[PDB]
Write a protein that binds this ligand. Sequence first.
Ligand SMILES: Cc1ncc(COP(=O)(O)O)c(CNCCCCNC(=N)N)c1O
Ligand SMILES: Cc1ncc(COP(=O)(O)O)c(CNCCCCNC(=N)N)c1O
Lengths: 369, 369
Amino acid sequence: MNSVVNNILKAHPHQTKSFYVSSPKIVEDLIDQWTILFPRVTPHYAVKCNNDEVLLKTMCDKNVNFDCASSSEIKKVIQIGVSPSRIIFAHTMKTIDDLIFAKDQGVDIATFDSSFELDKIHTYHPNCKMILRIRCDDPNATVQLGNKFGANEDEIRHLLEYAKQLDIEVIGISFHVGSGSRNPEAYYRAIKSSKEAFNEAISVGHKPYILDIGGGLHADIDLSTYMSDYINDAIKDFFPEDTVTIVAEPGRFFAEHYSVLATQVIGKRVRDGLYEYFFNESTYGGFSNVIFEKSVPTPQLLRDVPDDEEYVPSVLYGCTCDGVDVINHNVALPELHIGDWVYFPSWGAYTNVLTTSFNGFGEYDVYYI
Amino acid sequence: MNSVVNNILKAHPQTKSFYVSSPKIVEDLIDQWTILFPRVTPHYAVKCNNDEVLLKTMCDKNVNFDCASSSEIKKVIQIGVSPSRIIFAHTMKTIDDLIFAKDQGVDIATFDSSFELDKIHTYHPNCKMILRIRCDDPNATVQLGNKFGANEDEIRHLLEYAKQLDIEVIGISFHVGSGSRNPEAYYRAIKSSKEAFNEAISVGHKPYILDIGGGLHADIDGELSTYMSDYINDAIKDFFPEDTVTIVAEPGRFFAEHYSVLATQVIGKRVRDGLYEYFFNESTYGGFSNVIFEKSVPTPQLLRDVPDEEYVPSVLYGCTCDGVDVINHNVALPELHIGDWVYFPSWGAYTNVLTTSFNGFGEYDVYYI
Ligand SMILES: Cc1ncc(COP(=O)(O)O)c(CNCCCCNC(=N)N)c1O
Ligand SMILES: Cc1ncc(COP(=O)(O)O)c(CNCCCCNC(=N)N)c1O
């Protein structure tokens, strides 16, 4: 990667904007790994994590399906050439106009966690196949989702009965333990709770057949099987039947390693032995994960330094006016100079999708390799 | 405002959330600025709200501009504003933005580092420089001191370095922090600015500008409070009484805050054990980033008329799949229904400028009144 980025810089000597270097082949290999790690689980890629059109086309061609959060994401996927039959509208709160659009296009599998959402379905998309999302938290997940989404255990039966009353077909149960989960027991407990909800749905008179284990998984490479082995044990313990279809909604598993982000030192200040640098990127650009996921990322220098190069205490600032916009508060690095380029590895998940134009910055290029 | 917004809805039988923006309000505030600060020329901080009608209103009312980047300079230049009315008030500017500023005739900028002076000498040697010193309001909403502004112990060195490079230092600036209600902070900052001003004279510069930065609110109770302006003017009298000194400021929120209201619709609802949870077609990743970055706890105004009606405990959620995305965790309101519109007053400062398209949301309209 150090070589590739350096070659891009030499081939494009007038490069000024920060730039993503994205590799479809990385994602292809990871899709193949998913197939091996989770042989029973059909991935519905969470478009919200990274909606890069080459990434989505790569997914499409590898027979990966899609989790869309809005009508805009549905449109993106359809424009790639994917059948709307391959989309789960996996957001429990959908606008009436988005529901009408989904019905029209052929997106007819969606999630819910409220009676009012069932009312909307009844009126606007009456034959949409529904998946009840239940709350099952991983308390150690990086981004918590439980307060806002998912039915509590005590309303499961009521919601299923209400769906039955409105002639709404409930076809399965989903959960999301939280974004950025490394807790295998959380998935085990979630899958157990899902079987209990599945059994309530059957009791009410539904004929469910889908388990949706949501997202949260990292592709941790040292590729580790701690998460997958235990998830598969839970699938075996609670959903052994070949009549059940299992799906997932991974975002970061595929998107994380898709891209690196290259950025240039544009300003510098050295005070009492502390080396402060300003980059043509920011927490309002590609680095929102510093704010929302507590990321503390270390860059790779593109300039070669000797093995014995002295590291100095460094502060990596974003380019905006704001004091909150600090990429890394403290990191030991070789001394950098205005004009040096660095890159941040594994910068494809919840990075480019969260860009703003705050302060008039936020621009970037994308190179595919 | 309630009838105005209802009128827009009746006139546009409208799906997206929308800003209702009033140039008159800003024109009136400009007239008030001239009364509150008769000696201070405002350079509006474009970053706060870059709406084109707002910028044109500023232009026509003889207000100047504080631009943070080349993109922002472009926005101002393209509406016919003389480059002489722009200060490039960012202490860390890319070489290519300086090149651009030089091309456009933007010939005044701030700095707080020796490396910045190196860049100026090489790329914009005619640029007149304003030294930004660090002077904090510890009670300001958004702190800036950590990241920007020269420390007291380096002021003389920085001025001597500019002199060695044949760079003209024409003044001193500070920013106590964004969202300041501490008059003492400004008094001390202006006192410190006069000390720096005298150091500049001692070194051989001929400074003539004091730039008091931004931070101020237009706090109204239909009369604007002078709690800040009176003491700022007192400090000006004490430390910069000379008519040979030009005083400027870089206000953002003072003019932008009250420029707009943001209307948004209830798109989802869930009532659980007496708690009323609502989902809106807006989010903290759309126009409500101030909930995250400024710890805003905004209360909406209902557009539907209610009888002098029981209030219930309500939670206002944003439309994204993130658990962080909560507009207001707890607010007492009359019961709302899917389809109800509400609006949020004084929603013009750091609101529309910070929109993302995360989850495929973030779209909005703008109506001018
Ligand atoms: C329904 C659904 N499916 C799949 C995923 C996928 O989760 P992942 O960890 O990528 O596999 C998510 C992500 N939940 C909001 C995550 C916000 C993260 N916000 C942020 N600013 N980084 C989701 O809501
Ligand atoms: C040089 C300069 N001038 C004027 C202003 C104007 O400040 P105001 O309070 O609007 O008058 C600012 C705002 N400082 C970064 C503001 C980040 C706020 N961030 C956020 N997420 N809201 C600034 O940096």
